């Protein structure tokens, strides 16, 4: 598990074919070794040495589209003859500047330089492809972004100028000088649907797609529908057409965010991680906002008409014809889901599978069937501090069993596949993981790679032989399946042969086998978070709540995924009942209630919640008499059942919120307090335990001297503006006289 920490959030990362991986955090653009241990070399594109975000940049709502410095990072032309590879970078700073140079040691010279090439906005979107296009197959860019942004300051001027005002897609040349474009070579826009945000770009088929979405970055909402742009992968624009994509299918309003992008390549299938507005950051984040919908290429290629919709032609006015039409996901696939962030689509054994990451630290992912059809999604990773993970997933290049996860200001490289939890065959061919497959010569579920080391191929079980093919006993008794070897020895309990031989026991040459209608009404449900172990009792309330005998609970998380279906527990008073929730994946589900008979009563959302782990305790030490409220910092404590107290168990009480809580410490001594939550115990740290402190009083003004503990003014009451501050003593001042401290009463 090697991460590697930047120090401020990841802007951009790419990962060259032999060079590394680079990564674009902050002022400063890295280069790492495929195992993310040592920088291998770094550039600095603001100023030497510092590299530190010039200005400061607000991670906003999770939907809202993120902001970095580092618009463009992407390397190509590498795995050339001899030609090493070029690595094309495009930056905030300098107008949105962009420089080609050499893929590898960064502190190399930039080749070409170039100005105006990405967006100089450090919230505007950008994305760009380069291709071979040309009499001579030069080296393009086509790169669209959004360059004029109506938040330009009097003291420095972004926008360019008054001719390249409304410039979308470019088409910048990686040989000419200063990376330049043609006059053709541009994609107007049209004004009135305020500005555009694309998402990617990716070559098919001889085109070039951007797929974006309208947006009003002063309001911070999408104002029309997730497009993609289809363009001629040509020298000169060839506006091929625009298609809406059409996934607000289980949401009310619809899903109108373009949240990332990936084409499965080998499958000609593009997938998008749609979304609704979540309000500001979580407060209409519902059970469905985010969807993970496929598409096509086919159907977008084709239902794609050249409309000037959203980008100017030379054949009609803006908004003043056709409205694009609505393509249409793959049915059988689309994955509805309460927060999604990235996907990454690939093929491997000819099966799709489609990594996602969730915006709470979640990489899971989910492997289409016989019709494209979804999975319920294996979580892979999580990562302890759920942080949403950054929209792009890379696949390492040089071992294709890893994948490189960014959230936040870390990047790690964790493998694609958890299949070590498979002890069986059949655990591991049920399962249906292409990665995977079961071993004879280690007898364990594994990789490829990772047994592969007997010749035999048929050693590495994977499951495109099935299921039903591991070796088993049959019935005259003999071996089914696939073995490695050849030659066995059988014995039974007691006739032995030997070796394809005739208590049972089939040993190999390196492993072996052995066998021997009134109204209902619904108040509210209480609480609204519960933690991912389950709750034993949840409260509902209402009305006429006994004119019942088969009351139900049908609680959905994801369209994928089953559903919980639950009876109540003991039907207390006609207004009240009571629920026991089992244990599930982090989420946050839709509570449908169904009584004896009829339709579900939406009750409202119910989110299962990460365990809570414990960030720190604010004072750390007490004076063994206690009383000093103590702050624990952490995060998910809203669900919280009880707190402990164990050193013999002490029962304290909590005042306690989402982040933090607080609680008088009670010991009257190195302490360690654990949180229960339905007859689990998690640690947090130790409390330890002194002496009171030694005292000394003199004298509107009051001095006191006392000779560990961190006491502050609301700690200490004093009757008649507190001062304190070490002097060895440790001397303090305020401006029949009383003193509260914890427990301690005095003077
Ligand atoms: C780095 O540069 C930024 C520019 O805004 C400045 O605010 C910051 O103080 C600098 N830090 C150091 C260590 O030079
Ligand atoms: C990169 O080039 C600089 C320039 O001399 C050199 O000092 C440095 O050692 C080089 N690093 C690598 C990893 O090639
Ligand atoms: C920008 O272009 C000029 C023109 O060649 C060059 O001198 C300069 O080094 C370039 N800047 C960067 C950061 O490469
Ligand atoms: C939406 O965009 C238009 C044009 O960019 C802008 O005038 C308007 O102020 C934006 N919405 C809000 C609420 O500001
Ligand atoms: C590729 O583009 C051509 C150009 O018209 C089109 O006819 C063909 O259907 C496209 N390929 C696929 C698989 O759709
Ligand atoms: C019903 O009993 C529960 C406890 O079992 C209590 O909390 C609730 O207030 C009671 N409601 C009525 C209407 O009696
Ligand atoms: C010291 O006391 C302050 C007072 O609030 C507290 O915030 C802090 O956590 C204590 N411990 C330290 C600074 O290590
Ligand atoms: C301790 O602090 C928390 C918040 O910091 C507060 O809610 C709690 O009531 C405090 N306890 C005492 C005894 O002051």
């Not at 990594?355 to 989910?366: N, S, Y």
């Not at 034993?536 to 994928?560: E, P």
């Amino acid at each position: 598990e090697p991460v590697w920490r930047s120090e401020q959030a990841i802007g951009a990362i790419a990962a060259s074919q032999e060079d590394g991986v680079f990564v674009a955090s902050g002022s400063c653009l890295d280069q790492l070794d495929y195992s993310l241990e040592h920088s291998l070399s770094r550039l600095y594109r603001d100023q030497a040495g510092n590299c530190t975000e010039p200005v400061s940049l607000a991670p906003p709502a999770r939907p809202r589209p993120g902001s970095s410095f580092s618009k463009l990072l992407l390397p190509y032309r590498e795995g050339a003859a001899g030609l090493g590879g070029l690595l094309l970078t495009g930056w905030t700073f300098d107008r949105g500047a962009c420089e080609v140079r050499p893929l590898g040691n960064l502190s190399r010279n930039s080749l070409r330089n170039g100005t105006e090439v990405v967006s100089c906005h450090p919230q505007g979107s950008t994305a760009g492809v380069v291709y071979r296009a040309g009499r001579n197959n030069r080296w393009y860019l086509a790169v669209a972004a959004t360059y004029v942004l109506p938040e330009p300051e009097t003291a420095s001027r972004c926008n360019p100028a008054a001719s390249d005002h409304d410039t979308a897609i470019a088409l910048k040349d990686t040989e000419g000088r200063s990376l330049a474009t043609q006059e053709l070579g541009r994609l107007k826009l049209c004004e009135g649907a305020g500005s555009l945000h694309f998402v990617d770009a990716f070559l098919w088929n001889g085109s070039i797609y951007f797929p974006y979405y309208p947006y009003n970055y002063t309001s911070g909402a999408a104002t029309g529908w997730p497009s993609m742009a289809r363009i001629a992968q040509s020298t000169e624009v060839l506006f091929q057409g625009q298609a809406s994509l059409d996934c607000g299918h289980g949401h009310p309003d619809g899903r109108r965010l373009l949240l990332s992008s990936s084409l499965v390549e080998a499958l000609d299938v593009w997938a998008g991680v749609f979304s609704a507005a979540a309000g500001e950051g979580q407060e209409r984040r519902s059970p469905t906002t985010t969807a993970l919908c496929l598409f096509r290429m086919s159907e977008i290629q084709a239902r794609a008409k050249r409309v000037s919709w959203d980008f100017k032609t030379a054949e009609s006015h803006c908004k003043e014809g056709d409205q694009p039409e609505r393509v249409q996901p793959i049915a059988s696939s689309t994955l509805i889901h309460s927060d999604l962030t990235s996907v990454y689509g690939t093929v491997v054994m000819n099966r799709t599978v489609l990594f996602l990451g969730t915006g709470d630290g979640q990489l899971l992912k989910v492997i289409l069937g016989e019709n494209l059809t979804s999975n319920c999604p294996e979580v892979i990773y999580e990562i302890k501090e759920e942080t949403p993970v950054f929209y792009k997933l890379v696949p390492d290049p040089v071992k294709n069993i890893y994948i490189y996860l960014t959230a936040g200001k870390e990047v790690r490289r964790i493998r694609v596949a958890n299949c070590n939890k498979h002890k069986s065959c059949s655990e591991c061919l049920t399962a249906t993981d292409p990665h995977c497959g079961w071993c004879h010569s280690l007898q364990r579920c594994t990789f490829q790679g990772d047994c592969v080391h007997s010749e035999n191929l048929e050693n590495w079980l994977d499951i495109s032989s099935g299921a039903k093919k591991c070796p088993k006993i049959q019935i005259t008794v003999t071996m089914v399946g696939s073995f490695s070897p050849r030659h066995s020895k059988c014995m039974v309990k007691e006739l032995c042969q030997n070796k394809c031989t005739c208590n049972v026991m089939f040993s190999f040459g390196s492993w072996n086998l052995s066998d021997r209608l009134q109204v209902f009404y619904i108040k509210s449900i209480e609480p609204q978070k519960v933690s991912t172990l389950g709750k034993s009792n949840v409260i509902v309330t209402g009305a006429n709540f006994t004119r019942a005998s088969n009351i139900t609970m049908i609680l959905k998380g994801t369209s994928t995924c089953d559903k919980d279906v639950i009876q109540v527990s003991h039907v207390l008073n006609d207004t009240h009942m009571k629920f026991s929730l089992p244990s599930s994946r982090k989420e946050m589900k839709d509570v449908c209630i169904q009584f004896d008979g009829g339709n579900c009563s939406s009750v409202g959302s119910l989110s299962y919640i990460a365990l809570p782990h414990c960030s720190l305790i604010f004072p750390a030490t007490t004076w063994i008499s206690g009383g000093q409220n103590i702050t624990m910092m952490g995060r998910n404590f809203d669900v919280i059942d009880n707190l402990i107290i164990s050193h013999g168990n002490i029962n304290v009480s909590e005042y306690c919120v989402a982040t933090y809580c607080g609680f008088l410490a009670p010991s009257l001594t190195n302490v360690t307090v654990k949180l229960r939550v339905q007859d689990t115990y998690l640690d947090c740290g130790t409390l330890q335990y002194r002496e009171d402190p030694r005292f000394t009083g003199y004298r509107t003004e009051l001095e006191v001297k006392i000779q560990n503990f961190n006491i502050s003014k609301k700690d200490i009451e004093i009757t008649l503006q507190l001062n304190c501050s070490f002097e060895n003593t440790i001397l303090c001042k305020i401006k029949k006289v009383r003193v509260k401290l914890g427990n301690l009463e005095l003077y």
